[PDB]
Design a protein around this ligand. Structure first.
Ligand SMILES: OC[C@H]1O[C@H](O[C@@H]2C=CO[C@H](CO)[C@H]2O)[C@@H](O)[C@@H](O)[C@@H]1O
Length: 347
């Protein structure tokens, strides 16, 4: 029918939003404003309070200030994934070691399964992250969730995205990811496809990826040109290198970028949506590069303005939000479905 989910399409999902009613605070809708790293001492940037009028986004959710723990929101999000044809939800994972995290992960897996969506984890730069506690956490996640019907596998293997994987030296990664490594997961019950973050130039990244024994790489950033990896004119050559070296390249595409409510000094990174033309251009470059898998930044990173989740026009007494302009609130979901179809036609 040309409507089915694609299980080589990964959409980055954030479960960090809270409401007073469910979570005790409007978590993440309220957010600290970052000081300017070049703006000197004594800055008092303040906070966005997460009121109805003033939330930590330049856009405004159709679903309002929702809780990521609300089963009825999760249902709606899974229906949005179905509309977008995105078969894998790539869940932010911060190693919070708290019961409210555990509850949310279970709720997300359960809701996903009702719609045949799969879930993988996006391993974030949590405090003192290192290859030993990464192994322990991979073991825990596979043990806890590996028998859940929504747990993602590719040819029998789980898959993890590793954000800011450059914060760990290749000599450490080798211990976890080489078949001969001291604490290897290879050939164990806990083996997985490990997808590292390609940032800078090939001269740095090629030996990093090889020496670290990653199975593949992704680029994350929705803003074109932010890094070498997030410059789509490099994707043909990145894919050629991946194929030559038996690596999986999963370029990240997004619909735009703007984070100036939380980072007012970061205007140079703004990428305008132009009624969908930015998203179209980026998605076309990924498909044209001949890749096997694509990642989408993001479902709902509202702070960074990369979301495809529906947004509505809103002007409050405190802020005039951006909105999808000439496009309807669900445009980025249905445009994702269009591109998934083009990707499948190519695959
Ligand atoms: O956008 C604010 C957000 O920024 C950091 O999180 C990263 C932002 C986007 O994606 C990556 C990969 O998922 C995240 O690690 C972090 O400082 C958050 O605390 C903050 O809310």
């Amino acid at each position: 029918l040309g409507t089915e989910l694609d299980y080589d399409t990964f959409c980055f999902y954030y479960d960090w939003y809270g409401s007073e009613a469910i979570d005790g605070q409007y978590r993440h809708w309220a957010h600290a404003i970052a000081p300017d790293p070049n703006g000197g001492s004594g800055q008092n940037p303040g906070t966005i309070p997460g009121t109805q009028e003033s939330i930590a986004s330049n856009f405004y959710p159709q679903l309002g200030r929702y809780s990521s723990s609300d089963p009825n929101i999760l249902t709606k999000h899974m229906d949005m994934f179905v509309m977008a044809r995105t078969g894998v939800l790539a869940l932010t994972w911060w190693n919070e070691q708290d019961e409210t995290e555990a509850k949310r992960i279970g709720l997300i897996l359960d809701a996903a399964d009702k719609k045949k969506i799969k879930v993988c984890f996006h391993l974030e730069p949590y405090p003192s992250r290192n290859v030993q506690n990464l192994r322990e956490n991979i073991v825990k996640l596979i043990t806890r969730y590996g028998n859940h019907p929504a747990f993602y596998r590719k040819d029998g293997k789980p898959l993890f995205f590793i954000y800011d994987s450059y914060l760990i030296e290749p000599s450490e990664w080798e211990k976890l990811l080489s078949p001969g490594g001291s604490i290897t997961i290879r050939n164990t019950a806990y083996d997985a496809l490990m997808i590292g973050l390609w940032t800078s130039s090939p001269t740095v990244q090629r030996p990093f990826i090889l020496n670290a024994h990653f199975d593949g790489f992704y680029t994350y950033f929705a803003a074109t040109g932010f890094t070498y990896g997030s410059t789509p004119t490099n994707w043909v050559s990145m894919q050629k290198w991946a194929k030559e070296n038996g690596k999986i390249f999963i370029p990240s595409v997004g619909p735009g970028y703007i984070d100036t409510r939380i980072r007012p000094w970061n205007g140079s990174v703004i990428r305008t949506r132009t009624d969908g033309q930015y998203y179209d251009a980026m998605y076309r470059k990924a498909i044209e590069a001949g890749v096997s898998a694509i990642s989408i930044t993001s479902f709902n990173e509202w702070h960074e303005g990369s979301q495809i989740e529906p947004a509505v026009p809103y002007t409050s007494s405190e802020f005039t939000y951006l909105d999808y302009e000439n496009r309807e609130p669900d445009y980025y979901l249905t445009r994702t479905a269009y591109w998934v179809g083009k990707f499948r036609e190519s695959k």
